Symmetry: D3
């Protein structure tokens, strides 16, 4: 695993964005061989999407041959509602880059047959073969996407009943109304995430401290899903300063020294 210890969210975004850009340019995607990118929504990926857009406008990347798959979507919320994941993604990323519509994959929270919808999402991915880089965040309890703790490390895209905590936390977007927030959501599984060739988790804020610690210093265990990324062939944790509160001083010094060359510039 790699731990990129940075100070700010702006830095994390720049670093994460640059890593994606580099992976893409090195892959050199074509129409027959696109670079498949897994993506998250929310406040965490904010600075990364912002950096990605900048680099693109600076002419450093083209998403012309990048295929994206998003982690989740609200069930029963209309696509153009400003708080659907589809809306967040276009407003924050797609509206400013050259990615073709056929290359954008998002779950249909309004599909009549949910199981079929999820099943097909999994199928669309396999049709491409594999996701080259799946970017995501982590819950305060180490959970991934809408997967609950103790999820099978082999779980797949499926619908989930949002937890009270998730509700309140998102009630703010449904303007502080936890009553507004949808009841269910469609989410990729942990297996879906782990099948990615490379996984990059964005860790921001002191409230992620315990999860960062479980991921980096703790032992592999299913209650803290994030900890199983220790078994993944290519995982990276990109974090800010506040999130490092639960790590030993030496652990942080280790990675800060080991990755010093890679964090200059961002």
């Amino acid at each position: 695993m790699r731990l990129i210890p940075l100070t700010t969210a702006e830095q994390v975004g720049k670093w994460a964005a640059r890593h994606i850009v580099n992976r893409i340019n090195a892959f050199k995607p074509t129409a027959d061989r696109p670079f498949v990118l897994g993506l998250p929504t929310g406040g965490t990926p904010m600075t990364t999407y912002k950096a990605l857009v900048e680099m693109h406008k600076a002419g450093q990347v083209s998403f012309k041959h990048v295929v994206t798959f998003n982690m989740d979507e609200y069930v029963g919320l209309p696509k153009e509602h400003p708080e659907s994941y589809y809306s967040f993604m276009h407003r924050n990323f797609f509206d400013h880059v050259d990615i073709p519509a056929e290359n954008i994959n998002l779950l249909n929270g309004n599909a009549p047959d949910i199981d079929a919808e999820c099943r097909q999402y999994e199928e669309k991915i396999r049709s491409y073969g594999k996701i080259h880089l799946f970017m995501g965040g982590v819950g305060n309890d180490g959970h991934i996407a809408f997967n609950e703790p103790a999820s099978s490390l082999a779980s797949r895209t499926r619908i989930k009943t949002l937890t009270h905590d998730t509700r309140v936390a998102n009630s703010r977007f449904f303007d502080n109304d936890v009553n507004q927030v949808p009841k269910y959501a469609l989410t990729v599984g942990v297996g879906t995430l782990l099948d990615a060739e490379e996984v990059m988790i964005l860790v921001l804020g002191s409230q992620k401290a315990l999860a960062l610690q479980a991921a980096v210093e703790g032992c592999v265990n299913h209650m803290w899903t994030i900890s199983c990324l220790q078994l993944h062939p290519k995982a990276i944790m990109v974090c800010d300063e506040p999130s490092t509160m639960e790590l030993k001083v030496k652990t942080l010094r280790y990675f800060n020294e080991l990755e010093a060359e890679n964090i200059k510039g961002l």
Copy 2:
């Protein structure tokens, strides 16, 4: 992983039995595509076999196209001895259901060539392809079948020298005589168990408390084999109240709330 927290052994049996029945009816086994079931012996599976028989008599399941493979057998004990696993299985299950004899697989504790016997057991399984649901119990130290702690998570069917503790614990069936109890036994390996598509462990009694805790809350480690089920794609722990003594109050509250819909009726 799933944790079905129930109060009694009778409930655990009803729940476990119903799960097996459901898996079977949904699979809809045929002569060319049978449902393969892994099975344990002993006091733990008692209420489950009892429930399975009831459901069958109630006309809810047919084992006409179910192929079973049992975890173990005593070496050098004659099949019709009432304390062989073969005898336990027929008396408690096979004598009351419609499973054909060719569909019943049990290790031959009397095979002249033991290694060959074990080797062939492994081969018979692969011939079918895979076990769809392997039911079992767990040792007080988290061990599986006759496998000892620190067994390779890839171990296979082989003969084992029973431990003093196992002897005494079973001496009761050889009527409190630990002297009667056989010295060796043939047991499926941990790899054999993990290759099952789904694994369901029955946990009964306060003496399993530490193992349940190692399985659910602890970290993955080989000393407590049961803990590695955390890495399995589809594992379920069905337990009674006494076995939950070592879990945190919140851990138990979590699963009790998460599985409330699934435990009504049994």
Copy 3:
């Protein structure tokens, strides 16, 4: 996992050597089907190479059809320098056995194109298919070869910048001069090691106590690479008395009783 608890390094060497010899004679290698052996250098493997040579001279083994792959080599150090791994290997093993030169694989610390060199090493291995037995040691922090803690359990042969600690520790061979010791080295990855059919780690000295404990009693975690051998299908830890200082009295008693038959003679 297996833990062979012995008293001395001489015993560990005899045991390890005998195990290799046995694995070879049982495999019965030919020109078209050689036995592939992974090997380490350093003070730890000393008594084993010494025992291996004895057994060979005693006519108990022939390495005529054994192909070996070594874990590492210093970058930019000339092959005949007495402190290169190539020199250690010939002086301590190859000079006294019947292994053909084409069967000896060592990394070229002087290859003009390092990445290509490493890439090809990985390719040479796959050409043979798989390593049947990879012998190695472990760092005081549980690390393997020149891989650093938190290495991906899927890492591959690559060049590494030696750590200050490694320098000092080896400065003695570059006659107590840490200034002499080379800056980089080529090392097989953890994935390379884990792909071995069987892995045997030599643990000598009280300074390995914590690592032995992490391997045997601890939970699976990437900071202590050695602990992930718990997930390997066939791992053995052969150790001396001083290295057992951090194990519980009962843990050591367990393995000492479980392996009593296998440690008589050595």
Copy 4:
């Protein structure tokens, strides 16, 4: 230590109040030998003060010869401000019982010489000799009164700079304004608390779960001050259900069985 596990805050209050009443009636205080009571303010002691008042009105206790000492007070906040501890105490307790004004001891957050004020508070206590029963609550981090974690277990009454967390948490009383909340407060020390003959901590809410666990199951350590009550001669933890989330199922079952006789009625 004693752990009274109850379900609700109302029960905790009834139990705590009854214990105080009983201690008083058994002591049978006089003008020359009063019963000295240590007291806390805040939402936690709410139901207890309510129960104490009821019992008094029911004619079950008289505070005519009870001397009270309160844990803290805001510095620089006028006594009659409705949010001073003096105001909370009279409105919630003193206004409804027969305690004489000379028997009420509260720190003077407005004393011109703070050190002298604190010094004298400590002196007033010793003049009486000892506090017979000190009731209090506990911070989410196990801290006591306004004492910070790692306070000397021998600390004494002194002024403290309130922590941001304390501010926000109390900003609600200064009507959600954290800006209103005073900057410093006068608080009894941990030594002051431990010198009490008997200490009774009220634990309500899931946010106290970790502290309850540190107090009951954890080891003695100064970071979680509450844990040192394990060394106190007569400590009791009276708690509600939510606060028990971090305890083992068996720990809670132990105390629930051990104190079953004492919790009927309340």
Copy 5:
């Protein structure tokens, strides 16, 4: 603390007995200044009483001026019943030594007023001033005498309701009848024990392994009363080999080396 690691119970007894004898001869007790000895009953102290008697017959000690206080007694069991602690003490010790009857203190399980009985026991001790050496054993859960886990480290002589586990364990003396075994017992408190100038705990059997570990390696905590002896000015743990199963190999090696001079002979 001191840990005397011996191999057998016979050795533990010889060592413990010799220590008592030495403490006595060095004190040189008189009629006005007797040596006060705290004593336990049960299978654990067996070899010690046997050794003490031998040394006395060998003319190495006289108990003419030794005053003894025993830890407990069954409530409502007649003194001459062969299973009362009074009977165990005379049959195993007093019947063979020169201690005067007025120097023997045992709790009166038949006192009409129990609280008074206990109160007076505490008073008799203080009249002498202090117990010079209190010998005892430890429960499998680290508890002392009939004190339950989480007892105040300042508890005193009082009556206790025996636990089911204690019953069964002692049912053997009431000839395997747990129905025979008395319901309550009078026991000295933990405070009583800790006030002893020196405390010596006899630890025999693998079932005490966890408690020995909690006492020697664990942290101070009230759930394992024995662990608080770490805070006592003069505590010694005399143990046999089986009881050391939970200690680290190095911990045992430490004390075995530190006390090598003191364990030759016994």
Copy 6:
């Protein structure tokens, strides 16, 4: 407890020295009421003695009425040998300050009757009443002075057989000869140290990291003597940066923020 986290040893010395100076000037010692100071020798106290001397020369302190007691001395080493603690103390401190010879207390490693020597040292201290500030260091294993781990927290001045590790570590002063280093030493006990009104431990170097962690974050336990300072009424840990390697990032941030005002200047 207090933790003064500084960057360098020079800072630690300045801080420690300033604290001593302040304690003295505030006490305002006289001929009839001197300030009693406990002192350590070795490399750790180096910068502190250097700072103390500076402040004295700067006219900020007079040791005219300061009585000092040193922690230890080598047995059988002549006082004027340059490596005796007496020599270290004069050369590094006494030779440059105004302390009278009658105010200097050092153990006599050459006393004919050692027990008497130690006994009297303890008596000299009590004659003064109490040590106002005892400064010291800590072993890599948390031990204090020459006291071994698991020492009674009530131990007293006595002779000790130096450990191999202590030998080697000090062999450097007996010019790298571990053969030169004396075999025994006289050391104050842990009780002696804890009786000090205030205890200040100097922690320098990464090798003290584990001990600093045991002192600050760990639980109270006798194996790490330093951890029991958590129970002391007035303890301070003054440390440098390297020694903080084992602390959590947040723990260090806590004290760095809590003591920011007190570490400016030094």
